Symmetry: D2
Subunit: 233 residues, 4 copies
Amino acid sequence: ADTIVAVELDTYPNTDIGDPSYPHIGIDIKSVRSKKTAKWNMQNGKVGTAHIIYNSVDKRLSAVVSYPNADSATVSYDVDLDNVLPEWVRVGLSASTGLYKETNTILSWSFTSKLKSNTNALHFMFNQFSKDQKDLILQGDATTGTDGNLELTRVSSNGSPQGSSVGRALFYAPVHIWESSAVVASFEATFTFLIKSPDSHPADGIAFFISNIDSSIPSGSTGRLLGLFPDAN
Amino acid sequence: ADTIVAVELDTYPNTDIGDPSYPHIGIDIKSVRSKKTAKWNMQNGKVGTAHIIYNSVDKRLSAVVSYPNADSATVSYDVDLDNVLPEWVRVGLSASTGLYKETNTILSWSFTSKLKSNTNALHFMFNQFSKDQKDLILQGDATTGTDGNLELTRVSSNGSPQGSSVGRALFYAPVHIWESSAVVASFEATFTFLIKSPDSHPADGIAFFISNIDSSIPSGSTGRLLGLFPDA
Amino acid sequence: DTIVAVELDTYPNTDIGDPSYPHIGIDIKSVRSKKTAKWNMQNGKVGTAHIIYNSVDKRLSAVVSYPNADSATVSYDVDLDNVLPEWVRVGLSASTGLYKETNTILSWSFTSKLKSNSTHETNALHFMFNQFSKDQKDLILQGDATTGTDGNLELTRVSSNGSPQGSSVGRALFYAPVHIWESSAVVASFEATFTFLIKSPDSHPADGIAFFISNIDSSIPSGSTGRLLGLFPDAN
Amino acid sequence: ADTIVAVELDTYPNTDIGDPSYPHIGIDIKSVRSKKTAKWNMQNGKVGTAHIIYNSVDKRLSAVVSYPNADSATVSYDVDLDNVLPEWVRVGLSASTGLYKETNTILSWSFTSKLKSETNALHFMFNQFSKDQKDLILQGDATTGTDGNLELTRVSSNGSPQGSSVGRALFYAPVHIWESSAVVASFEATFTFLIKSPDSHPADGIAFFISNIDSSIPSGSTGRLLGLFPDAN
Ligand SMILES: CO[C@H]1O[C@H](CO)[C@@H](O)[C@H](O)[C@@H]1O
Ligand SMILES: CO[C@H]1O[C@H](CO)[C@@H](O)[C@H](O)[C@@H]1O
Ligand SMILES: CO[C@H]1O[C@H](CO)[C@@H](O)[C@H](O)[C@@H]1O
Ligand SMILES: CO[C@H]1O[C@H](CO)[C@@H](O)[C@H](O)[C@@H]1O
Ligand SMILES: [Ca+2]
Ligand SMILES: [Ca+2]
Ligand SMILES: [Ca+2]
Ligand SMILES: [Ca+2]
Ligand SMILES: [Mn+2]
Ligand SMILES: [Mn+2]
Ligand SMILES: [Mn+2]
Ligand SMILES: [Mn+2]
């Protein structure tokens, strides 16, 4: 299937498939059963920030999720992505709903990859998303243009979120994420999100992910699979 | 056909289609008959640099082509690209040969687009090109493994350039080059080239170009059309 | 010494060559702008200033926009090789006089690049400020200029009640000298961006904000409050 | 005295003050006795590259020193620089000679600091150094030339390096290296060097360092102290 490396912002505890008992941030390598998580004090209706980083020296994937004037949640996992991802990848944001629902609004998204050989660089930054955003591949229920925002999960005209939704946005350009004859390689992602819900239960979450170039939404990956994974193994 | 805005580095004077009597740099808007040129003191076998720039305020497309420790050649043309290019474009390098040949080697290529609305940004930079460069669309005789270099025109194993060759590389991502509800829009391209020839006559040149997304090499655009244009 | 500036002039001083309306202007070695443009200044709304110049076009351009309003633009063709010293400092100035306004800077970005003729490589400086701390050690504050109040740079005196004060001058310069041009340069570009909030109780707000490039050792000239925007000694 | 955090490129083994028996790269925190080293295959007369990085998430200072077409040497040390450096610092390159001599030529120097609270950022990049480089504070025998290079140690008119030399260049601007109300803070330094010597013994090395703003060359910091430290404690 697809090869997926992802940082999950999991809003629904699915303790059946190895989630903790609370909303968490987690690093998923080839599986939705995170290789490390951390308690996340998710704030319904407030605009949060995700910072993802990795470099070829430390070989450690790290993430930080803050709200302004609250303590950040952090998670790190040591992983050689040379042994996990293909040389050439695409980068994306995924989200999902199931029985429970939430808005999965992305307000901004930045990414930077650098690769000094034995530098090549890509950088994109989105603070506005247009009705036809030709440098984005939208999959599933994903839309651009409403208030200049990327809405990853289905939302009605009245701004009310929908259940059993999966949706992704991938940067159109392939990315050279690692090279054999490389001395240093870094990448860095940043996105802002707004997750609103009517219910005491919001579900199911947003992820930043790196996949094989041709990656598509796996079948029935709505809900607890965050549109990333086919099964819950 | 394709909509083409380009900065030509023309090494062969084709005075029949409006070239000056000397190697020149020129700004082509929807035509190979440049809207302004400037004398270019092209150096066979030396590594040169091209800088292209434009912004929504000045609305002026400018180019500089230098060799280290030589006087630069410059050309500018005032053009509102809102009235010329589509909102969404691709960026690329083209080159060509005809009766006469040159190596059209690209050693580096950088591009930056910015767009502050009523900022979004793209940046790529290439100093090495790999055997399979998946963020480049190579058209025509264009190759990337070489020696870390983009070779836009056919070159044999002994490093000798070939005649009647056309070849392009476009950045895979579409680029948002202008917007109606924009306050400022900038772009900037930079490439290094090495143009070598055995002959006194090298031909026919390299261009940086911005086109419609689906742009392909027009038919028999070898030689004086630099792989950009169908006719003159 | 030498001032090159983009003025955001909120008070028409028609005696020293201002138009009859609030304007944006390019001042070279004088407060009598070399070109202006009508500016529809919005009291209490957050605007944006974009300044740009390059060694090829040799044209200094500015855009001042308010969200969902027309941009005002001004350009002037000038070779800054013949005007500024090789090495400069960059800054924001503001002032008040009879009429007053808040001269609040909420963000300030600057980028200089300088690709050389000898070598292939570029020299570059970049700073970006979105927050300003109580002690901002990479800023030289002159006059009534302060940092820390809501993480903003307040260029003119503002009392405890948040009410702006008259007869105030104040500047902030980036601590590092900037190499703005070189003889053996092929291209040289610079770009400044700042957000401002200009609020006033009066129908008359005064007197304005400028981005400026000066000699390194530049200080607030004597009685440059009011119409001289803390940039110029006399109104010549 | 001065507070010094540095990445040493040590070319002379001073085993009496805790150097390994070979040329090494090391991470020095408030002392010339490195907190971690690594064997460095120093190449006399070839142009090398130093890459330093650190971030507030991992809190790990990492360095890589390569030559073209040779294996890089790497060193990392986990350190919270919040507990070590002052909030505001200056950045610099130091070098030295003693009994033995080497050219300590810097051909390029780049630095980038970021600080998300919007983000504050500084970036400078030098590929050419002018006769009067007004954004650099040169201390000791440090010069900038019409060869376009920063020469940290005394070099005669014969292109021949001199003994008992100390010399530093600090970026003129203070740098905000950390903040209490920060979510992420990163920095990254890169410099190219050429270290040439007539002898089999070259000495004594180059460092990238972060210090207190008002930092000056300590007394008798020639030779094995690399112009960084007063004593060898
Ligand atoms: C009871 O679990 C269901 O609802 C949750 C909440 O959305 C989903 O995560 C999950 O996939 C199921 O559809
Ligand atoms: C005789 O002219 C031919 O050869 C030159 C040299 O390339 C081309 O420019 C031109 O288009 C023709 O093909
Ligand atoms: C009547 O003019 C006075 O007030 C205006 C308003 O600021 C100033 O510009 C000027 O210097 C004078 O002090
Ligand atoms: C005996 O060692 C001396 O020479 C070496 C070589 O430079 C220096 O490192 C050291 O400080 C002393 O001056
Ligand atoms: Ca879950
Ligand atoms: Ca021609
Ligand atoms: Ca005035
Ligand atoms: Ca030593
Ligand atoms: Mn989970
Ligand atoms: Mn021509
Ligand atoms: Mn005026
Ligand atoms: Mn040592």
